[PDB]
Design a protein around this nucleic acid. Structure first.
Ligand SMILES: [Mg+2]
Lengths: 661, 453, 49, 145
DNA sequence: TTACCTCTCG
RNA sequence: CGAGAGGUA
């Protein structure tokens, strides 16, 4: 066979600054760009209207009510024939409020910042690429230290070629005076380095193919006199040995992967769509406003302070800018992954704030909590009861539960039979509990199955399907023999019901999820539905037997049972008419072939007569034979109880056969 | 031809684990290898190796054809695992018309060219020798990809020599302005060598290699390196299987061999010559496996008894031991492995350089004068007078004339070593070329001739 | 519950996808080689090709 | 009981499950190299380690279940055991363009490449715990997150 | 561990 | 809506 082929793929990748922009940018009829949100304002102060350039702004994130623009007029969406996509007065985007769920916005940052994950891991990805001490790259990042030779890409007149150096005491003013206005800037950019602009630039001009060459050589040289020294030393030799492999690998991937190494330090910053951070008025909820929003404002603020500081005060020293650079970085860090560095970063009243990593992680993290399982419609719950008379394929469903689950189906019926004019008309009939609603409900559920599950669903048998039968009362009735699979008892257990809507779904339930089809357990092949408690007691009693010797007769039978029956029906009859008891011994003629399970015992007495007939008495049977060696008669000693079990098993087989026909 | 390697593997998988009618054939394996080899996005080399392994496993049913050998060489080369590439080449050569396949009209990076360029950088010129020779039998011209370096001296013919990346001395100082005008001047394109941020390799040489060009090594450095290893293996056999040995004079000799072997990397010489490791010999190992040469089911603790258990239970058996050599039935290799290498010599180089120059000359190459100058200087380092006649002959043959001082010093060397006859021959040809012999040397040459007479 | 969650994760991807792999190898079961009560011998073998 | 099953399945220490076993595995590896050559020694050593390990792990879990009267078929344990025992670790000595020094590759793969390639691939079997196994897989989406 | 229910509190 | 507490099976 030729396989039917389907190819699907999912790709994950870090994104460039230009992309984050395109995710959130539009050009209006005026020709004006929209998208960056600058102000920290959320809505309005007691006005309940989104502010402009605000975290909830309509123009950047889409309209709040459909068709009603910023101005307050309403143009009918569904028609683009003569509708300004963007109104002259305001950016309207008239079509839908759904966009507020999906639309994105971006924030420009004056200072380059660094992502936490690459830096945080002990085998830091940035460090692995850098080949410089982890402390040195980090120190520059969180504390004021300045690199001296930032770019190896371009030649520079000053030549200390130093690393991060704390002291800027080196003449810097005379150097600026000697140099032209910004002549110093060209030189400084080439040489002096600060913050993370330096990291971004060092990462940006790096030679990967060269990096591999150096590494391999160093890796080859290391291992000289390897495995031949004091315990302390070898350990160190190895740790370097690996850092080297790890680094070669990262670079190789970069060569063939289309992801640019500089993207790790971030120029633009992304913003979640406004709905996903409802921040609804905390009208007594008190937590309705999102911490997402709270964290967002801080980054927005420090950034605005810096943009102004630079514009306002070129004269003010780098000390003013240096002070607030660190502040901006820290807000972003908490927003991305707080607790990575272990900083509490919490308001005193508040718990440590929720970083976006927390949102994703764990049981309540998006993937486990929402992606793997979800709440559903067309479902119900109630307590369970014994239901002995039901058949294996059936279950009893309370009527109140049913009317809820099968409502749509009944409305159709009322309309189809023309007992109601409109959908609204019918819903009324359902409420007055008129008797007709019940005849229609019964008709609709006749060949439609339903699914039942118990709470701790340990194994497949936890969910099984049944044909529902309407019952009055408020509990679900279940067949006695299905309880082992569900592990259910009748002392407070509850169950849930689901209805299968599609035709495809309905076929699967009848054909692959019904009890008759699943009578053997998955683990070794054993029967899962077998008679278990009271039922077993009854079967044992029927087959238990009768007193045999001293128990039935006081004195030896030597010094000195009777009923003989021809067909089994007569015997069962005598039991009813009280002629005999369940345990009384009896003799039954058998016309068939010696199927009685009994021990291999030779006859107790053979009695042989002169004309030729021989009678053989065994413990449970008498066989009469003649000279021609033919068995004239066989009689079995038994009790009524034994014949009753045989008859039921036999009749059931024959009945099923006669029904098929 | 899609670009996504997987779509083809899916079709292969339907075939490999299916019924007999649909089983894979040699053409099939070859199509899947192409996808992986000619793919633009990920490492895809481990994958090729695994696929090859499957083919070898089905040896009885399937045997290789020419495209197989062709495709394989491209992959290993482009990925810079040159050692395996050479093993495969041995096969394509046996076939006729092979070179034509490897160069697929130059359509995909000129795989034939890439091989040669790599072999050289790696200093594997004995192999270059074999290859360049091979091409000839097939009448396929050396492709244009052979190219000059920033120092124009580099060319396949001259690069393997020891002085590296160094312009050759031509007497007259190279005309720097003249080179510029030639490549691009006034209008035109020159690969201006200024470093840029974008990740496209600056050497035009790197193009066509997935990650980068092979690292540069001279014939010399390579030769020392190759040498150490053979020795190391003998030492290795000594380390694990060698404390005990057949010879009864071993106790005195052991002390000597061990210290010495260590020295080699950084009498009983005959005994060392005697010692050998059988590698590539499946059979030797086979014999070894056979052995001819609480309270649960626990395998027996000694290795050799485990081997008996492995057999009884059917876990492994002798039939299972095969490799490509056994499977594809190539007999050429057995000879190569056992021999130790030949040590490096300046003279060794001279013979090889010359042989190379003619074949490239034969096949349409245009070596630069600087290249010849490279061979010339090398000849001078350890006296090799005879070469001078052929090489100067060739350079003028190539329509190139060298500066006079270099010419005279070699004539002086010949006079010093007594090769007066060679000097005269040079002057006679020099006259034919029309270049002028220095007068002072010329009178001296006549005086030397008078002395000989 | 922890043991089950983790066991399902290691082997979730395995589905029966083909009729014959084409192997010609099989494990060998002996009554001996372990002291095996006949019960154990029977149970291992039932259901196998 | 259950703790023991978690211990056996999550193989934190190879010896922890059976002392007799660690003995054999460390022993085999040292001894095998001298006796056999590079193309064939790693492969045979792997096959032997894989075989003993597999028997022991199934047998140890099973004894715990049989003590208490719970009967589960073997096929089921074998699907799980295979994943624990299916991968190999390339060693420190091995660097080539094809393979990096510490990596996890699958057994069938490694074996195939070894026949094909004269380049030395050095490998040894690593028993992986149930938890570790998941983290090394083909699907980032779920299998690993 | 799963599911289920009620409440109070800023 | 975010926390806390008492239950159920
Ligand atoms: Mg209960």
């Amino acid at each position: 066979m030729i396989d039917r082929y389907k190819h699907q793929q999912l790709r994950i990748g870090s994104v460039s600054p230009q992309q984050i922009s395109a995710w959130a940018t539009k050009i209006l009829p005026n020709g004006e760009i929209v998208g960056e949100v600058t102000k920290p304002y959320t809505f309005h102060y007691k006005t309940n209207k989104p502010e402009k350039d605000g975290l909830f702004c309509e123009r950047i994130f889409g309209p709040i009510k459909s068709g009603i623009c910023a101005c307050g007029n309403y143009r009918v969406i569904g028609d683009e024939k003569e509708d300004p996509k963007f109104c002259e007065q305001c950016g309207v985007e008239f079509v839908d409020s759904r966009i507020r769920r999906y639309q994105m916005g971006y924030i420009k940052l004056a200072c380059p910042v660094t992502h936490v994950w690459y830096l945080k891991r002990l085998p830091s990805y940035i460090a692995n690429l850098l080949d410089k001490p982890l402390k040195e790259l980090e120190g520059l990042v969180y504390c004021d230290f300045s690199f001296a030779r930032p770019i190896t890409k371009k030649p520079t007149f000053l030549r200390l070629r130093g690393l991060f150096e704390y002291e800027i005491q080196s003449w810097k003013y005379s150097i600026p005076l000697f140099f032209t206005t910004q002549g110093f800037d060209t030189f400084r950019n080439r040489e002096i380095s600060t913050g993370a602009g330096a990291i971004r630039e060092q990462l940006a001009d790096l030679d990967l193919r060269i990096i591999i060459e150096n590494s391999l050589v160093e890796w080859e040289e290391l291992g000289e006199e390897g495995h031949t020294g004091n315990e302390w030393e070898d350990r160190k030799v190895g740790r370097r040995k690996d850092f080297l492999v790890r680094r070669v690998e990262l670079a190789k991937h970069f060569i063939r992967t289309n992801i640019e190494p500089e993207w790790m330090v971030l120029c633009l910053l992304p913003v979640l769509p406004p709905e996903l951070r409802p921040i609804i008025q905390i009208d007594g909820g008190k937590l309705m406003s999102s911490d997402i929003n709270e964290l967002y404002r801080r980054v927005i603020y420090r950034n605005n302070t810096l943009t102004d500081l630079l514009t306002t005060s070129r004269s003010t020293p780098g000390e003013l800018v240096m002070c607030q650079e660190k502040l901006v970085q820290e807000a972003v860090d908490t927003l991305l992954d707080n607790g990575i560095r272990g900083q509490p970063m919490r308001d005193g009243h508040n718990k440590v704030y929720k970083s976006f990593s927390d949102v994703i992680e764990g049981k309540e993290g998006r993937f486990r909590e929402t992606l793997l399982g979800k709440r559903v419609d067309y479902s119900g719950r109630s307590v369970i009861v014994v239901g002995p008379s039901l058949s294996l394929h059936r279950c009893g469903l309370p009527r109140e539960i049913a009317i809820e689950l099968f409502q749509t189906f009944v409305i159709r019926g009322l309309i189809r039979q023309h007992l109601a004019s409109n959908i609204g008309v019918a819903k009324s009939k359902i409420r007055e509990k008129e008797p007709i609603v019940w005849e229609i409900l019964q008709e609709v559920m006749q060949g439609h199955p339903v699914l039942l599950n118990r709470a701790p669903t340990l194994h497949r048998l936890g969910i099984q399907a049944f044909q529902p039968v309407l019952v009055e009362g408020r509990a679900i009735c279940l067949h006695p023999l299905v309880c082992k699979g569900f592990n259910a008892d009748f002392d407070g257990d509850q169950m849930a019901v689901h209805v299968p809507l599609s035709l495809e779904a309905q076929v699967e339930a009848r054909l692959l999820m019904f009890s008759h089809m699943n009578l053997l357990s998955p683990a070794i092949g054993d029967p899962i539905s077998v008679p278990t408690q009271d039922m077993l007691i009854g079967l044992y009693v029927l087959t238990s037997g009768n007193h045999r010797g001293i128990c039935v007769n006081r004195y030896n039978p030597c010094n000195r049972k009777e009923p003989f029956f021809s067909n089994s029906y007569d015997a069962i009859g005598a039991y009813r008419q009280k002629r005999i008891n369940l345990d009384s011994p009896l003799w039954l003629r058998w016309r068939l072939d010696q199927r009685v399970i009994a021990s291999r015992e030779t006859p107790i007495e053979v009695h042989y007569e002169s004309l030729g007939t021989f009678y053989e008495i065994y413990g449970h049977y008498l066989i009469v034979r003649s000279l021609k060696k033919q068995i004239l008669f066989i009689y079995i000693r038994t009790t009524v109880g034994h014949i009753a079990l045989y008859r039921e098993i036999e009749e059931a087989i024959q009945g099923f056969s006669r029904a098929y026909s | 031809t899609c670009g996504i390697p997987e779509i083809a593997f899916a079709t292969f998988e339907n075939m490999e684990y299916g019924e007999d009618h649909m089983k894979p054939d040699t053409e099939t394996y070859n199509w899947v290898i192409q996808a992986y080899t000619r793919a633009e996005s990920y490492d895809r080399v481990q994958d090729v190796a695994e696929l090859l392994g499957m083919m070898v496993e089905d040896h009885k049913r399937v045997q290789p054809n020419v495209r197989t050998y062709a495709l394989l060489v491209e992959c290993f080369t482009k990925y810079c695992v040159v050692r395996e590439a050479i093993r495969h080449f041995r096969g394509l050569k046996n076939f006729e018309g092979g070179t034509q396949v490897l160069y697929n009209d130059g359509k995909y990076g000129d795989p034939l060219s890439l091989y040669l360029r790599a072999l050289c950088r790696e200093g594997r010129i004995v192999e270059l020798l074999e290859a360049l020779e091979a091409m000839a039998k097939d009448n396929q011209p050396i492709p244009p990809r052979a190219m000059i370096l920033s120092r124009k001296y580099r060319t396949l013919v001259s690069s393997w020599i020891e002085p590296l990346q160094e312009e050759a001395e031509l007497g007259y100082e190279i005309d720097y302005i003249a080179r510029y005008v030639a490549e691009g001047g006034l209008t035109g394109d020159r690969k201006r060598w200024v470093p840029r941020r974008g990740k496209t390799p600056l050497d035009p040489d790197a193009e066509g290699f997935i990650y980068s060009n092979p690292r540069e090594t001279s014939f010399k450095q390579r030769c020392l390196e190759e040498w150490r290893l053979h020795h190391r293996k003998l030492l290795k056999t000594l380390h694990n299987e060698g404390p005990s040995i057949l010879g009864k004079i071993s106790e005195s000799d052991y002390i000597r061999l061990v210290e010495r072997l260590r020295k080699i990397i950084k009498e009983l010489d005959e005994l060392i010559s005697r010692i050998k490791l059988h590698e590539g010999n499946t059979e030797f190992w086979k014999r070894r496996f056979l052995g001819e040469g609480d309270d649960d089911d626990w395998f027996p603790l000694d290795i050799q008894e485990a081997f008996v258990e492995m057999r009884k239970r059917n876990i492994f058996d002798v039939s299972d031991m095969y490799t490509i050599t056994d499977a594809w039935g190539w007999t050429w290799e057995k000879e190569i492995k056992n021999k130790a290498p030949q040590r490096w010599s300046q003279e060794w180089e001279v013979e090889l350089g010359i042989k190379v120059m003619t074949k490239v000359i034969e096949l349409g190459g245009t070596p630069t004068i600087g290249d010849c100058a490279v061979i010339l200087r090398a000849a001078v380092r350890a006296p090799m007078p005879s070469a001078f006649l052929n090489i100067l002959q060739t350079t003028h043959s190539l329509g190139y004339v060298f500066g006079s001082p270099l010419y005279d010093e070699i004539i002086t060397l010949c006079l010093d070593l007594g090769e007066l006859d060679a000097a005269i021959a040079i002057v006679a040809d020099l006259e034919t070329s029309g270049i002028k012999v220095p007068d002072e040397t010329l009178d001296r040459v006549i005086s030397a001739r008078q002395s000989s007479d | 519950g922890y043991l089950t969650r983790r066991l399902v994760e290691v082997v979730q991807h395995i589905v029966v996808r083909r009729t014959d792999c084409g192997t010609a190898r099989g494990i060998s079961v002996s009554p001996r080689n372990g002291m095996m009560p006949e019960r154990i011998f029977i149970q291992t073998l039932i259901g196998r090709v | 009981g259950l703790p023991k099953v978690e211990q056996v399945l999550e193989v934190r220490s190879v010896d922890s499950i059976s002392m007799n076993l660690e003995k054999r595995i460390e022993g085999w590896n040292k001894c095998i190299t001298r006796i056999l050559g590079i193309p064939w020694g790693f492969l045979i050593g792997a096959e032997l380690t894989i075989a003993q390990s597999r028997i022991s792990l199934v047998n140890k879990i099973q004894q715990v279940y049989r003590s208490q009267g719970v009967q589960i078929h073997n096929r089921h344990l074998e699907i799980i055991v295979r994943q624990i025992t299916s991968k190999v670790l390339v060693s420190e000595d091995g660097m080539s363009n094809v393979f990096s020094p510490g990596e996890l590759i699958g057994l069938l793969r490694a074996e195939r490449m070894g026949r094909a390639l004269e380049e030395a691939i050095c490998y040894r079997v690593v028993l992986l715990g149930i938890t570790r196994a998941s983290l090394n897989t083909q699907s980032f989406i779920s299998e690993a997150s």
